[PDB]
């Protein structure tokens, strides 16, 4: 246990009046992606998720984000998914074969795998069972 000014943190000064003063402004951090709605029915949500899945390959997260986008209204969400379908990472069979060969040569060193796979970022290699 080290005690010093370069080890401890500089806590603020207690301001009883300033506690319940500034909690309405300044900066709200984070971006809202989904918010529950009580008026929404469970069955309607399940049906919308199922149709979004077996209509354009929308997972639960993407369909939920789309529903939040259109003010939690299913009708305007079932007629907006085909406008912009979210094509996922385009991993061609050739690129998968190169990934397998690079893994065989080098292993889990994605830095070396990127040398022979320069079109893919390291985050794409880490994201990419058998």
């Amino acid at each position: 246990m080290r005690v010093g000014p370069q080890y401890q943190a500089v806590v603020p000064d207690f301001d009883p009046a300033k506690l319940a003063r500034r909690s309405q402004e300044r900066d709200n951090l984070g971006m809202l992606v989904w918010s529950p709605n009580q008026n929404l029915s469970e069955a309607k949500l399940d049906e919308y998720i199922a149709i979004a899945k077996e209509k354009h390959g929308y997972n639960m997260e993407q369909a939920l984000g789309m529903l939040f986008w259109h003010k939690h209204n299913i009708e305007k969400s079932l007629a907006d998914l085909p406008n912009f379908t979210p094509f996922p990472d385009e991993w061609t069979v050739e690129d998968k074969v190169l990934f397998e060969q690079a893994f065989s040569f080098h292993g889990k060193t994605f830095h070396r795998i990127q040398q022979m796979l320069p079109d893919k970022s390291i985050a794409s290699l880490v994201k990419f069972k058998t």
Binding site: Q8, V11, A123
Partner: protein
């Protein structure tokens, strides 16, 4: 019927510490998928955390340390060898691609949750990407570079006179205890394994220095503690701390390396015995910030954090895991709840009672 907020960034799982490093940022992606497929995702507010700027980090950390963190890359490790030696970066805290972005996301989730709790806009805030409690003011320790718990508490201290920090990681929360060692505005309670163990601190005789004396509680443990003993010792201590300290906000660090069958831990807890702590803390009706921590058997971490998030929402989930993108990780039982091993509990009732009585005596000296 409280309100729970959830912070998650989709790219947090694509950061790789390195080959053979026990720390896998992928345990949060599987937790998120289990939450999505269990139906708990639809029950809370979901936020995309902001990237904490370097100026926000230097509220606690030194400017030189944050500048080194921002400047170092795996490509230019040659010019910084003295800096890496000084800042404790490279051996166990490796230099990997996207290190600073990982730190920014982990810190931003916690700071945004603290801000949300400050404005009375939520009753609970969850961030499983945070909880790095080993980082020091000007150096890295224990797989951690930036201490986001300290910055989150510093955000909370703007609005709350007293903040209580509880740590149920199997390791001592040395980074958080050191930062708030000489202040009484934060009381740091820690349950940990002691005796020739990482990080080497957390003695029963460590109670605070100067103005913050008696405001640091430490409960050393032995090997193989189970659900019954942990429940017997957790609720009384926490109730006594509530009675004496009387805090206004709580920060709970739910480290999952105290579970049974961990790759780096030696306790014998289960998922239910881990979430009993969350159930007990939730009964005091104080603002709560639930953060992650350790945990090196990844499927157990996912199960534990999913069950704790269900506990926070006051929602029951079946023992049968649903279908998710990582269904092959949870085989062959495909159950949410785990079973304990057959290790012996070295925490005899006499030892536990002596430690509890000493802690009770220490807590009664609070001004």
């Amino acid at each position: 019927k409280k309100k729970v907020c959830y912070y998650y960034d989709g790219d947090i799982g694509n950061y790789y510490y390195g080959q053979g490093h026990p720390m896998k940022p992928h345990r949060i992606r599987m937790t998120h998928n289990l939450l999505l497929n269990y139906g708990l995702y639809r029950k809370m507010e979901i936020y995309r955390p902001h990237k904490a700027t370097a100026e926000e980090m230097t509220k606690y950390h030194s400017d030189e340390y944050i500048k080194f963190l921002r400047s170092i890359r795996p490509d230019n490790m040659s010019e910084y060898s003295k800096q890496m030696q000084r800042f404790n970066v490279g051996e166990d805290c490796p230099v990997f691609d996207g290190l600073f972005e990982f730190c920014q996301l982990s810190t931003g989730g916690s700071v945004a949750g603290a801000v949300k709790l400050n404005r009375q806009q939520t009753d609970m805030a969850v961030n499983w990407a945070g909880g790095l409690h080993h980082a020091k003011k000007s150096e890295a320790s224990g797989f951690c570079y930036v201490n986001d718990i300290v910055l989150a508490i510093l955000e909370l201290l703007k609005y709350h006179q007293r903040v209580l920090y509880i740590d149920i990681d199997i390791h001592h929360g040395d980074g958080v205890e050191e930062a708030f060692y000489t202040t009484d505005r934060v009381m740091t309670v820690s349950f940990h394994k002691y005796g020739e163990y990482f990080p080497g601190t957390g003695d029963l005789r460590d109670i605070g220095a100067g103005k913050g004396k008696y405001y640091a509680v430490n409960f050393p443990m032995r090997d193989g503690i189970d659900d019954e003993s942990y429940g017997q010792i957790f609720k009384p201590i926490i109730s006594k701390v509530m009675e004496m300290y009387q805090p206004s906000a709580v920060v709970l660090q739910c480290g999952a390396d105290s579970l049974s069958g961990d790759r780096l831990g030696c306790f014998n807890l289960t998922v239910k015995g881990h979430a009993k702590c969350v159930e007990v803390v939730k009964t005091f009706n104080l603002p709560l910030l639930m953060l992650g921590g350790g945990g090196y058997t990844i499927r157990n971490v996912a199960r534990c954090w999913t069950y704790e998030t269900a506990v926070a929402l006051d929602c029951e989930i079946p023992n049968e895991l649903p279908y998710n993108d990582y269904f092959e990780y949870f085989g062959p039982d495909f159950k949410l709840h785990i079973s304990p091993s057959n290790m012996t509990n070295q925490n005899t009732p006499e030892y536990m009672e002596k430690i509890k009585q000493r802690l009770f005596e220490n807590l009664r000296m609070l001004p």
